[PDB]
């Protein structure tokens with residue numbers, strides 16, 4: 001089989017309320033091969049079919065998909081927001097293209113600053129984001145944002161923003177692209 005440069009882990013989140021946020025996170029599977037990635041993707045529910053209040057997260061092995069993880073606490077995220085009416089037309093395409101960015105190490109020189117990606121399915125609107133390790137590394141953050149924006153094919157006129165997890169936790173953009 002053909003190996004990937006990193007081992008990745010898929011996590012699932014289900015909003016409960018009678019549970020603490022951390023207790024609602026569940027590790028689903030791990031893979032480090034091209035064949036194993038496709039085996040997972042071809043046999044698990046699509047993001048567009050998840051119930052409102054759930055999330056899928058793909059993070060490098062060893063990094064939990066939460067602000068508290070050492071590799072995320074000083075970091076932040078590039079955020080993509082979508083309307084509820086775009087669930088069946090763009091959500092799945094955006095998520096898969098995002099996954100291929102991660103697994104295919106599309107950020108080259110700054111690959112070590114990437115922690116993972118998260119897709120949130122909500123009644124008000126869906127969100128997809130790429131999490132990075134340091135919200136102060138301007139060159140790294142800016143590079144990832146530009147590469148990501150181009151890959152998704154977003155019209156060069158609709159700017160996306162980068163938010164530090166610290167700011168998100170204390171409810172806005174450190175950078176825009």
Ligand SMILES: C[n+]1cn([C@@H]2O[C@H](COP(=O)(O)OP(=O)(O)OP(=O)(O)O)[C@@H](O)[C@H]2O)c2nc(N)[nH]c(=O)c21
Nearest residue numbers: 021022053055065066067068069120122127168169171
């Ligand atoms: C990513 N994340 C989210 N939460 C909790 O989940 C809540 C919901 O944040 P959300 O990321 O699930 O998006 P949502 O659109 O539902 O919410 P909104 O942006 O607040 O309108 C946060 O306010 C926190 O209470 C988190 N709580 C902890 N402890 N750690 C995390 O990494 C973490």
